[PDB]
Ligand binder design. Structure first.
Ligand SMILES: *[C@@H]1O[C@H](CO)[C@@H](O[C@@H]2O[C@H](CO)[C@@H](O[C@@H]3O[C@H](CO[C@H]4O[C@H](CO)[C@@H](O)[C@H](O)[C@@H]4O)[C@@H](O)[C@H](O[C@H]4O[C@H](CO)[C@@H](O)[C@H](O)[C@@H]4O)[C@@H]3O)[C@H](O)[C@H]2NC(C)=O)[C@H](O)[C@H]1NC(C)=O
Lengths: 50, 70
């Protein structure tokens, strides 16, 4: 799973393991997954045929 | 993650905690002062030798101390 959204860029040699829903839109998600509330972790589904 | 586990008035403990580039640096010095008034830090010079270097990599903005009570 790869992160795609963050509030700010990381400091060097640092980790963030929190899987909370990012506020992609200006509307507050408040713990609700939906449109403009995208989940940060997205896999790539690696296949040998790619 | 319990990554690092170590076992080794009349006593003053000085520590410096410094978080740089994912490294937590702890400098320490213990001195046996005898002072009547503990209202102020004692006047003098004490050099703090380095003690602990941790590659924890966490982000720190707040801290709190732990106490022993009965
Ligand atoms: C390590 O962990 C700490 C805490 O967990 C992180 O600290 C973050 O610090 C920033 C700055 O203080 C906080 O940002 C705050 O955002 C509020 C919302 O603003 C949104 O919109 C602006 C654009 O207008 C975006 O830039 C912003 O990212 C938000 O999306 C603001 O209202 C806040 O402003 C208030 O506080 C400042 C002082 O900080 C005052 O000067 C202002 O007048 C106002 O009162 C503030 O900007 C952010 O919320 C903190 N994060 C968390 C989780 O709490 C560190 O970033 C983190 N380190 C790393 C490397 O990630």
């Amino acid at each position: 799973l790869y992160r795609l959204f963050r509030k700010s860029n990381l400091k060097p040699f640092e980790r963030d393991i929190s899987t909370e829903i990012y506020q992609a839109g200006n509307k507050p998600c408040n713990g609700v997954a939906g449109f403009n509330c995208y989940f940060p972790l997205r896999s790539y589904s690696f296949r040998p045929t790619y | 993650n319990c990554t690092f586990e170590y076992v080794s008035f009349k006593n003053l403990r000085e520590f410096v905690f410094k978080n740089i580039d994912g490294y937590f640096k702890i400098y320490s010095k213990h001195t046996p002062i005898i002072v009547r008034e503990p209202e102020d830090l004692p006047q003098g010079f004490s050099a703090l030798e380095p003690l602990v270097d941790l590659p924890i990599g966490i982000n720190i903005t707040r801290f709190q101390t732990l106490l022993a009570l009965h």
